[PDB]
Symmetry: C5
């Protein structure tokens, strides 16, 4: 016979070894496949899909969760006051947990790329006004007033002209540190002008926030989530 | 020597593994083969052969089984009355158990294709009349009267003209469900006209039913039968 | 290393396995061969050689075995009487055991082919007469008289003309059955004429029988003999 | 299966065997590399770098080690007297231990090649004088006076002209013997002239010694050092 | 993995198996070789070298062994008398044990070829005379007198003309038999003429015997000797 020498690692079962096992049923011809639309090949295909951000994730909402899907604007708000704010942390807890992206991020250890957040205005066709959207880069001081936010990366959104507007988070990474000191970029929504509306129209309307990863987004190192029990 | 690593599955005996064993008698030259007509290569060759259906499988027959091989028609029967009925269930119990097809179906788990049932009339050459053969598609209501059966897939058979006629079950599948709700297609034989005969001829004749699978018939997943003990 | 899986049959020693073992003395160069006439390659070469049949295997011979090598003819014998008889059963007990062929047949399980038996006459050059040799095919009734033997396959041998004559058993097979019913072909030697001799010559002479397998003879399935102890 | 025979050495783990093991994480794509200047490929690249010799390794220095990095010359010294002396023994204890070369030599068993020692003069730009550097070949008597040293391989160094001078140890080997009798080449620094200086300049200056292996230097047979604990 | 089957001989260590083992030090580059004159490739190179035969191996010599290296001739010896005698048995005990050939023969089991024995005369340049050398073939009667030896293979050696002469043993083999009956060829040295010498020259001189195997000499089957303890 052929002189062989068993080397270390013989007889071991590695749950990640990718070998070939004996077919239990050699004579069986599995039912052949047909065409089913919507086949997915890579999870990133799913991450590029906009899902709803629960920006309005208040403790008082928990019992009427349907209200977390959108936040509001109103006439009472004065020009220049802060409307809402949240950071762009897909993996971490918070608004992003509701998105398909943030849920899949938990299934991985590292990730990086651009993100795009879309804002949709639902109020009466008769309403008009301007909101100021601002992205404060990582390791930056959250804007104090409307005027400072304006000096940074921002977008004046006139919902009297566009019912929707999209912002792009240029770049994110994620590093675990703990037992803080970390801080990723911060989106802040400001009232540039107050909410203007004629007689006969609701004086309180809602904004819906959707988000998704762009093409350059990628992830590595799998790890089962902690989202279930 | 050659560095090898034994992988999981070493030393196991799989009754379905298809390996090569050492020839017990290496010097032996087995007697060479000759030509024997009728070599069979695939069981389906056998399934395409018409065998006799025991349509007349009555509890009162059991002691004189030879009578199950054929059912009868007579003068007493009135025009339009139901003569016989059975479904096209090769694998299941019933008339099909007598056929070579139904016996081989038990040796498998799944099957599908077309079937063809042939009816032969044995009565006196002097007899004439018309029988109506009808196939009621799967999940269909068995014909109530001759007239409704006529509206479905049917064949007016005049045994005064043709001593034999063949019907084709377009398509069958089989799904186990149980402990009903399943129902495959139903062949129904009706008296279109009464049995006509002159003086001197038997007033009771018999029909013989033969059946076989067509070419598109196929089976998969072997399993030892329950027909023996 | 190379992923391998030990299959059933590992570690077994099959006395008929034909493998390769490690040379006990790798540096040794065995004495080279020279030419020795008479090299044998196949046992059948030996079977084609005529050896002496002990046709005269009487219980009264055992103490003077040299007499089994030949039987006799004499003047006392009357025209038409049976001289000797034996069957063509190489493997079985009897006259054939003395031949090299019958001895080698015991070393095998099956065999078939033609055989040739030669008869040699040793008496005085002055003697003359005719003997009738007859082969009675397998499953045939042994000749009752000279006349019937003559109607079957036979040879009129005039030892006044030929000192030797050869007969050919067309075909033999062998089937074990037992604990008869089997019977292979039967050679019968008859006196066609009486033994004629002048004054001065011995009135009793001997015939020697030699036999061998022809070219079409072959054997299969080895098995140690029962000839030794 | 394939007939194999396990040979001696099966199941052994040799700490120096260079095999291939199963990748613990087959789906992982390690972060790709980028360019980092200063990649090292062979330790000899480091050995060709001049490092400081602690020629002034006195027992009285130990508490002010910074003084071992350089030895001195002064006016008090008379023409012809010995300034310093040490041998060219990279691996062994002594001045060479401070060099990167001598430290790496301990990580090996054998070595051989040329070495180059550089001497740098740090005193006032106004000082002048001549030092005599001499290499006494292996198995040679260390020079007794300046005059004999001059007859051997030497270099008259005028630090009034050159602030630095380099000497080349032609060849070294190393052989362990012990429990001496071994002796490698000996560098001796002599005062050819006394230290000359004008009014206003320090009357004591220092020499710094740097050394490195040349290109032909090579080492073999690794062995963990004894420099740590 | 690859289906393999361990065959008999697995896990065995055969001291003569010629396999490949793992290099204990894979990174080590052994010191390279240089040219050393006198490399030997085959032991037969050594066997072709003449070494001194201890023909004069007397029991009385043992305490002054230097005398075994040569035997003598003298004036007292009468014309025709036997001078010395020994056989050509390299492997066996006796004179041949002193030769390099006989010592190496013990390291083997079989051998065969030609041998050549050289005789050298050391006496005074003034001496003359003739010696008769005779080889008595294996299985031959040792010569009784000078005259019979002369009739066989012989050489008349006149040491007044040639100071040396060489004899060739045409062929030897060796067969162990024992617990004689064996006998290989016998060299016999005779005095053809007496030793002649003038006044002033020694009346006793010595002959030195050297022997070696020729080119056709070869050996097979190694076996450790019995020459040491």
């Amino acid at each position: 016979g052929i002189p062989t020498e068993l080397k270390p690692g013989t007889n071991q079962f590695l749950t990640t070894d990718d070998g070939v096992s004996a077919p239990i049923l050699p004579g069986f011809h599995p039912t052949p496949p047909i065409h089913i639309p919507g086949e997915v090949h890579n999870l990133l295909e799913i991450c590029r899909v906009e899902t709803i951000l629960e920006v309005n994730n208040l403790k008082t909402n928990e019992t009427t969760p349907m209200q977390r899907l959108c936040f509001p604007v109103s006439v009472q708000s004065k020009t220049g006051e802060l409307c809402a704010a949240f950071r762009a942390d897909p993996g971490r807890d918070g608004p992003w947990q509701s998105t398909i992206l943030g849920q899949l991020c938990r299934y991985y250890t590292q990730w990086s790329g651009s993100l795009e957040v879309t804002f949709m205005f639902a109020g009466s066709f008769m309403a008009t006004g301007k909101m100021l959207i601002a992205y404060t880069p990582p390791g930056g001081n959250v804007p104090a007033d409307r005027i400072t936010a304006m000096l940074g990366t921002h977008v004046i959104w006139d919902f009297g002209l566009q019912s929707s507007v999209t912002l792009v988070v240029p770049w994110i990474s994620n590093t675990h540190y703990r037992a803080d000191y970390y801080t990723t970029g911060i989106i802040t929504i400001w009232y540039q002008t107050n909410y203007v509306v004629p007689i006969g129209a609701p004086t309180t309307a809602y904004i819906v926030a959707l988000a998704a990863a762009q093409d350059n987004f990628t992830m590595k190192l799998c790890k089962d989530t902690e989202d279930i029990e």
